[PDB]
Amino acid sequence: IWFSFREISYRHAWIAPLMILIAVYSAYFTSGNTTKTNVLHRFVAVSYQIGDTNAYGKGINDLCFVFYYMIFFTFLREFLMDVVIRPFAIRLHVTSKHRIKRIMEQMYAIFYTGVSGPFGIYCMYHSDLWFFNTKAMYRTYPDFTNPFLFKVFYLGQAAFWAQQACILVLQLEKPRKDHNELTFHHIVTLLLIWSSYVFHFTKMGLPIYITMDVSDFLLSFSKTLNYLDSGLAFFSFAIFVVAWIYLRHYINLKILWSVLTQFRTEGNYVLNFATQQYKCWISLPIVFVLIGALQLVNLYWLFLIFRVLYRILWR
Amino acid sequence: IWFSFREISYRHAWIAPLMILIAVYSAYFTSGNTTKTNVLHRFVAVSYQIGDTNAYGKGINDLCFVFYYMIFFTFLREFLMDVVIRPFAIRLHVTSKHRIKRIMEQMYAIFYTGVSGPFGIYCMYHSDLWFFNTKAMYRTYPDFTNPFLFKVFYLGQAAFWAQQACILVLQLEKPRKDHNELTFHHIVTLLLIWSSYVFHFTKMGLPIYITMDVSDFLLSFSKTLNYLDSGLAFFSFAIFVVAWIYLRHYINLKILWSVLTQFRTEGNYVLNFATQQYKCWISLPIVFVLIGALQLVNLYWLFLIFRVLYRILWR
Amino acid sequence: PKIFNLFRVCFISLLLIAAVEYFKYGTRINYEWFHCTPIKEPQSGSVIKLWARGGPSCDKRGEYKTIVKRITRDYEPNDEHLSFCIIENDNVPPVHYPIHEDKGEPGYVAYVGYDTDSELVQELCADSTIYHM
Amino acid sequence: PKIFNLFRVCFISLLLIAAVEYFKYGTRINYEWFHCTPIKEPQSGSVIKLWARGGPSCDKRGEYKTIVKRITRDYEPNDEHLSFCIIENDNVPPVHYPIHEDKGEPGYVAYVGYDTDSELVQELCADSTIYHM
């Protein structure tokens, strides 16, 4: 029933995205010819496979994929949020309101970050990038083709963060203080993702995702133990501080040192617009500045984290 | 004195434009080298003379010329308006207010149109265009170069109407009812001027200026004799009706018939982007529609003129 | 008294003036896009034959420009090195296409290929000088 | 609940995506503008000599493209008919410019002129085929 079911959608927000996803998947899978052609393939799978190899190119079908899994992640956020977290988040209870609002949001945070972190370390594991060995982020720069897992992870992150920005600017309900800085974070995350996928700097973009995810996983664990306070809170937070220092500041700073020393002398370094070799002396400032952006934001976050540590130490 | 003289400018609006004009002219003329070079030449004279011939090209210096004589016409409108018309317009008297506002505006109308009409017929006289002999508006189409008088008249009209539009949109004081239709008239006049100078359809644009000016001269004579009513009013208005019918409707309609029959078959008619020969079957619709615009506006004006004639006949 | 409206309308008008000015210039420097259409008829292999077919506006300069564009844009010399040749039709004036439907023998004809089949291009370009890229 | 703001930000983002996509494509199809600079050294008359001088990115294809562009853009064949020739340097691989300052002998060299001085172009282009436009 048209608006009776609009109401039931008001009772279950995820239902319309689930309806769209199930319709598209059903059309693609009942068609039989689950091939590289048709249309729904370009919508629901990574396209531009180079021959019959594990190497995928770039194109407009990437935009189609990102759009479709924006729809998917919009379904997943709402469905997981209510049906899993709220019964869990009041199944033991945290009687407040904003308390429960932050519990459910941070539980979703830990869920997607716990999914996206280890997958990132997996995709970094079986590749020459192991343990941030920058010498590998430039040794073959133009990198027109990515492996399957690599491309899927990269476009999944793109879709997820684009959907986060879409939820943000489309004010359904306006949350507290953290709003605008959070918008800045999503904007710079999308600038990283897009400008590194488009300009082929994707290997050098993988470790930054890994650091950001693992730091956010530990941060979310500690914050949810804070809003669900217990003895474990302090220990988890101290481990978060250690890992934040190491991963974010040390790894991103050594990556910046790398951009300097092994950008100038670790492969092709003569600009050639014909072969789309953009690693040059004109791109080094852009790379350094646009990673120093994240570095300064991390410094600010660290300052306030320090402040928090001091105050909780003297309380 | 800085704002004492700002006040005196409030008492004499034209004074700042006169100051700018006299400074630029003084700099150009005292320099001695009144040559085709320097800078002030490009600002205060028609440039792009082809060799040492009476034929002038097109370029950005045309925009500089149009700007500078926008400044000139802004001076002239105010200076003539007050110092000549108001002493004349109350020297015999027309005690009202809006009455005097319309007298001075229509006196300026008759002045510039009486200057710009006969000059148009002069520039049409010593050329193969005599008596609207269209067979001459296409016999040599690309027309990259104009004579001296031709170019000066064409850019003078451009500057004058651009300045009228500038005065209009910059609301100094908002006049009565006629405002928005008047804006439409200025907008379409500038579209004619610019799109016919840029696309080399300038011979075919001269007669339209001539018709518009002569019709406006007779209209202004009759309207000012109306707001300064006398026995002469009726006779002048009837002559205006005759000349309006003939010039505007008959001449513009025969020009449209010409665009059809002697656009398709009176010279080069194969589009060639390399030699900027735009007279083609793709430009015929644009020309016909954009002149039929003026034709429909003239029809509307004629309808209301008819209405006026009927009511004054039965009064 | 409103000035920003004046700059809003003046900026729009001036930008439109500059847009039409660039339209005329752009369609004049690269006109063969509008008039000439490349006709490629592949031979055996990576070797193809090029020419242009248009109206009277597709003169020999337009044919040459469109042929060169196809040669340097459909073949990647960073993958492997190509080699072409361009042959003029001397029994033809510079403007040589009737408007309607039977244009005739084209002014310029070119053979292009790669080096895996360079011998073939040497065979088709019987005497015309072979260019490498 | 505001949707038009969402389309305002999405349209801007999508247009920027399409702008960078076209930037990459435009700088790739016509790259010789950035890398190669035409060096024209006039002979006696309307005849000039052309070549290109750039970095390692100005390969023989870039030299050929920039020479052809100069020939077909600095000379108007509707005023009078021109005639040129293009000479290859065979003792040179396709990528042949050092980065720094002494590029060496260019890969392609062309002589262009008009027909009022066609004999001269025939003299300079000793054996290379003469093209007309």
mmCIF file with all atom_site columns, C-alpha atoms in Angstrom, chain D residues 21-90:
data_model
loop_
_atom_site.group_PDB
_atom_site.id
_atom_site.type_symbol
_atom_site.label_atom_id
_atom_site.label_alt_id
_atom_site.label_comp_id
_atom_site.label_asym_id
_atom_site.label_entity_id
_atom_site.label_seq_id
_atom_site.pdbx_PDB_ins_code
_atom_site.Cartn_x
_atom_site.Cartn_y
_atom_site.Cartn_z
_atom_site.occupancy
_atom_site.B_iso_or_equiv
_atom_site.pdbx_formal_charge
_atom_site.auth_seq_id
_atom_site.auth_comp_id
_atom_site.auth_asym_id
_atom_site.auth_atom_id
_atom_site.pdbx_PDB_model_num
ATOM 1  C CA . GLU D 1 21 ? 39.179 13.553 -17.200 1.00 0.00 ? 21 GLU D CA 1
ATOM 2  C CA . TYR D 1 22 ? 39.171 15.938 -20.159 1.00 0.00 ? 22 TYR D CA 1
ATOM 3  C CA . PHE D 1 23 ? 42.378 17.589 -18.957 1.00 0.00 ? 23 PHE D CA 1
ATOM 4  C CA . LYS D 1 24 ? 44.175 14.257 -19.075 1.00 0.00 ? 24 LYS D CA 1
ATOM 5  C CA . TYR D 1 25 ? 42.692 13.427 -22.474 1.00 0.00 ? 25 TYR D CA 1
ATOM 6  C CA . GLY D 1 26 ? 43.422 16.846 -23.961 1.00 0.00 ? 26 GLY D CA 1
ATOM 7  C CA . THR D 1 27 ? 47.005 16.940 -22.778 1.00 0.00 ? 27 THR D CA 1
ATOM 8  C CA . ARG D 1 28 ? 47.450 13.418 -24.117 1.00 0.00 ? 28 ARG D CA 1
ATOM 9  C CA . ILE D 1 29 ? 46.056 13.820 -27.639 1.00 0.00 ? 29 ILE D CA 1
ATOM 10 C CA . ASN D 1 30 ? 47.865 17.133 -28.219 1.00 0.00 ? 30 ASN D CA 1
ATOM 11 C CA . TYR D 1 31 ? 50.936 16.891 -26.011 1.00 0.00 ? 31 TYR D CA 1
ATOM 12 C CA . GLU D 1 32 ? 53.478 18.434 -28.370 1.00 0.00 ? 32 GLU D CA 1
ATOM 13 C CA . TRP D 1 33 ? 52.174 21.857 -27.391 1.00 0.00 ? 33 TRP D CA 1
ATOM 14 C CA . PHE D 1 34 ? 53.645 21.402 -23.915 1.00 0.00 ? 34 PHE D CA 1
ATOM 15 C CA . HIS D 1 35 ? 56.863 19.631 -24.854 1.00 0.00 ? 35 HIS D CA 1
ATOM 16 C CA . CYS D 1 36 ? 57.849 20.861 -28.329 1.00 0.00 ? 36 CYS D CA 1
ATOM 17 C CA . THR D 1 37 ? 58.492 24.477 -29.286 1.00 0.00 ? 37 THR D CA 1
ATOM 18 C CA . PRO D 1 38 ? 58.654 25.279 -33.027 1.00 0.00 ? 38 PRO D CA 1
ATOM 19 C CA . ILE D 1 39 ? 61.860 26.971 -34.160 1.00 0.00 ? 39 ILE D CA 1
ATOM 20 C CA . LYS D 1 40 ? 61.397 28.792 -37.463 1.00 0.00 ? 40 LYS D CA 1
ATOM 21 C CA . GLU D 1 41 ? 64.426 30.254 -39.216 1.00 0.00 ? 41 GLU D CA 1
ATOM 22 C CA . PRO D 1 42 ? 63.371 32.184 -42.340 1.00 0.00 ? 42 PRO D CA 1
ATOM 23 C CA . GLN D 1 43 ? 65.215 31.799 -45.624 1.00 0.00 ? 43 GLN D CA 1
ATOM 24 C CA . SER D 1 44 ? 65.218 34.409 -48.402 1.00 0.00 ? 44 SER D CA 1
ATOM 25 C CA . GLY D 1 45 ? 61.592 35.315 -49.060 1.00 0.00 ? 45 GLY D CA 1
ATOM 26 C CA . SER D 1 46 ? 58.360 33.695 -47.899 1.00 0.00 ? 46 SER D CA 1
ATOM 27 C CA . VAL D 1 47 ? 60.294 30.442 -47.449 1.00 0.00 ? 47 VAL D CA 1
ATOM 28 C CA . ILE D 1 48 ? 61.142 29.461 -43.875 1.00 0.00 ? 48 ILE D CA 1
ATOM 29 C CA . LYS D 1 49 ? 62.675 26.407 -42.223 1.00 0.00 ? 49 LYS D CA 1
ATOM 30 C CA . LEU D 1 50 ? 60.871 24.609 -39.405 1.00 0.00 ? 50 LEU D CA 1
ATOM 31 C CA . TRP D 1 51 ? 61.793 22.134 -36.712 1.00 0.00 ? 51 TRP D CA 1
ATOM 32 C CA . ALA D 1 52 ? 61.018 21.437 -33.065 1.00 0.00 ? 52 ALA D CA 1
ATOM 33 C CA . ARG D 1 53 ? 63.218 21.578 -29.976 1.00 0.00 ? 53 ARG D CA 1
ATOM 34 C CA . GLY D 1 54 ? 62.156 20.024 -26.694 1.00 0.00 ? 54 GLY D CA 1
ATOM 35 C CA . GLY D 1 55 ? 63.038 17.466 -24.089 1.00 0.00 ? 55 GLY D CA 1
ATOM 36 C CA . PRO D 1 56 ? 62.977 13.678 -24.338 1.00 0.00 ? 56 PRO D CA 1
ATOM 37 C CA . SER D 1 57 ? 59.196 14.002 -24.565 1.00 0.00 ? 57 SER D CA 1
ATOM 38 C CA . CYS D 1 58 ? 59.515 15.659 -27.995 1.00 0.00 ? 58 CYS D CA 1
ATOM 39 C CA . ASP D 1 59 ? 59.917 12.449 -29.962 1.00 0.00 ? 59 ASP D CA 1
ATOM 40 C CA . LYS D 1 60 ? 59.685 12.256 -33.746 1.00 0.00 ? 60 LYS D CA 1
ATOM 41 C CA . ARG D 1 61 ? 55.892 12.163 -33.589 1.00 0.00 ? 61 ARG D CA 1
ATOM 42 C CA . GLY D 1 62 ? 55.808 15.401 -31.621 1.00 0.00 ? 62 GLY D CA 1
ATOM 43 C CA . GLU D 1 63 ? 58.198 17.061 -34.045 1.00 0.00 ? 63 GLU D CA 1
ATOM 44 C CA . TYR D 1 64 ? 56.110 15.954 -37.014 1.00 0.00 ? 64 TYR D CA 1
ATOM 45 C CA . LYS D 1 65 ? 52.867 17.123 -35.423 1.00 0.00 ? 65 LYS D CA 1
ATOM 46 C CA . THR D 1 66 ? 54.211 20.537 -34.482 1.00 0.00 ? 66 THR D CA 1
ATOM 47 C CA . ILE D 1 67 ? 55.797 21.049 -37.901 1.00 0.00 ? 67 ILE D CA 1
ATOM 48 C CA . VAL D 1 68 ? 52.559 20.155 -39.675 1.00 0.00 ? 68 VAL D CA 1
ATOM 49 C CA . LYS D 1 69 ? 50.624 22.450 -37.360 1.00 0.00 ? 69 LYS D CA 1
ATOM 50 C CA . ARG D 1 70 ? 52.923 25.365 -38.145 1.00 0.00 ? 70 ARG D CA 1
ATOM 51 C CA . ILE D 1 71 ? 52.761 24.672 -41.883 1.00 0.00 ? 71 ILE D CA 1
ATOM 52 C CA . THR D 1 72 ? 48.981 24.474 -42.034 1.00 0.00 ? 72 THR D CA 1
ATOM 53 C CA . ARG D 1 73 ? 48.374 27.302 -39.571 1.00 0.00 ? 73 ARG D CA 1
ATOM 54 C CA . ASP D 1 74 ? 50.854 30.054 -40.492 1.00 0.00 ? 74 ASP D CA 1
ATOM 55 C CA . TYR D 1 75 ? 50.172 29.874 -44.244 1.00 0.00 ? 75 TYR D CA 1
ATOM 56 C CA . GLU D 1 76 ? 46.861 30.602 -45.935 1.00 0.00 ? 76 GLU D CA 1
ATOM 57 C CA . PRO D 1 77 ? 46.300 28.534 -49.107 1.00 0.00 ? 77 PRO D CA 1
ATOM 58 C CA . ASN D 1 78 ? 43.130 30.458 -49.989 1.00 0.00 ? 78 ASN D CA 1
ATOM 59 C CA . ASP D 1 79 ? 45.258 33.561 -50.584 1.00 0.00 ? 79 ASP D CA 1
ATOM 60 C CA . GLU D 1 80 ? 47.806 31.718 -52.686 1.00 0.00 ? 80 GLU D CA 1
ATOM 61 C CA . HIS D 1 81 ? 48.887 28.115 -52.920 1.00 0.00 ? 81 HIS D CA 1
ATOM 62 C CA . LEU D 1 82 ? 51.833 26.991 -50.835 1.00 0.00 ? 82 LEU D CA 1
ATOM 63 C CA . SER D 1 83 ? 54.200 24.053 -51.172 1.00 0.00 ? 83 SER D CA 1
ATOM 64 C CA . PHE D 1 84 ? 56.312 22.393 -48.489 1.00 0.00 ? 84 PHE D CA 1
ATOM 65 C CA . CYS D 1 85 ? 58.491 19.361 -47.849 1.00 0.00 ? 85 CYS D CA 1
ATOM 66 C CA . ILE D 1 86 ? 59.397 17.340 -44.755 1.00 0.00 ? 86 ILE D CA 1
ATOM 67 C CA . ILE D 1 87 ? 62.810 15.723 -44.329 1.00 0.00 ? 87 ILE D CA 1
ATOM 68 C CA . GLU D 1 88 ? 63.504 12.984 -41.796 1.00 0.00 ? 88 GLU D CA 1
ATOM 69 C CA . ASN D 1 89 ? 66.783 12.527 -39.939 1.00 0.00 ? 89 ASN D CA 1
ATOM 70 C CA . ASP D 1 90 ? 67.566 8.830  -40.244 1.00 0.00 ? 90 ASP D CA 1
#
